[model samples]
Target: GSHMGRIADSRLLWDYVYQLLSDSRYENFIRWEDKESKIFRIVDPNGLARLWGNHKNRTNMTYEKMSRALRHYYKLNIIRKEPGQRLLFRFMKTPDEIMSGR
Candidate 1:
């Protein structure tokens, strides 16, 4: 496979993001801007989305599309926007909800 070829499954994008959030090395790309509210912002939104695209085999993915996918989390009650804010989101699940399969 080429450097941009298919690799990780797109369905696991959430888990990938979750794992990245827990890794300190990626703090500059994505981090807990507000730990108490579980609020996280893609510090380097484009960079992080690019990595996500690579992981998901979405060579054409853009931050707009990624934001749309994240909006799906809103429907599932997994994530939501900070009141009156943009580029900031809060994970709205409990420990069990977050670690359900693990």
Candidate 2:
């Protein structure tokens, strides 16, 4: 059985975004805005949302839904909205740093 069927709720959304940004194919949909600050912007929200929806097997997923999930991350110190910017967000920690588990 393939492990690809797992549904991604809010908790793993950051992981999904991280993987997407790591892939060159998704550059048109998202890219680093300030790599040093761990900031990125979604160049095409609808396009990214569509891909995300497909990945999670949720055909109805929209940017609104995805953004809502993103908002949940703020309190968890995963990602935060870039002030006064749309489609921009900054990760609280680098992937390696976050995974290190203090």
Candidate 3:
């Protein structure tokens, strides 16, 4: 859990995303499209990708790559796209709980 103490050190991509969404600092970059359904949208894709790159220490990271990682998580039931939607992603539960390591 100590590793999650710092957003920059988060090895798990979801944790980085969750941290950003949970913090008011990123309110303009990301937000809940439908909180009841746990759906969220990247209001500022470039900003999100930039922050994700920051967490990975990948200066060259792109939104495509960040999205690729998220797509991979679908198999784990961690995150999924809204049917017929491109910019939206939904989780099985609250993101805070999801990142809680439970």
Best by lDDT: 2
| Cα lDDT tens digits for candidate 3, 1-102 | 455563322237776677777793635788878878888887888888887777668788778777767666776677887789988888964556654866
For candidate 2, the 10 contiguous residues with the lowest summed lDDT are 6-15
Number of clashes in every candidate structure? 0, 0, 0
TM-scores vs. true structure, each candidate: 0.73, 0.76, 0.71
lDDT, candidates in the order shown: 0.74, 0.79, 0.73
Write candidate 2's Cα lDDT for 1-102 as tens digits: 967895545576677877888893735788888899888887888888898899878878788887777767777777878679866888885687767865
1 versus 3: better lDDT goes to: 1
State which candidate has the highest TM-score: 2
TM-score of decoy 2: 0.76
From the highest TM-score down, the ranking of the candidates is 2, 1, 3
Off by over 4 Å in 3: 1-11, 25-27, 93-102
Residue 99 CA displacement from its true place in model 2, Å: 3.8
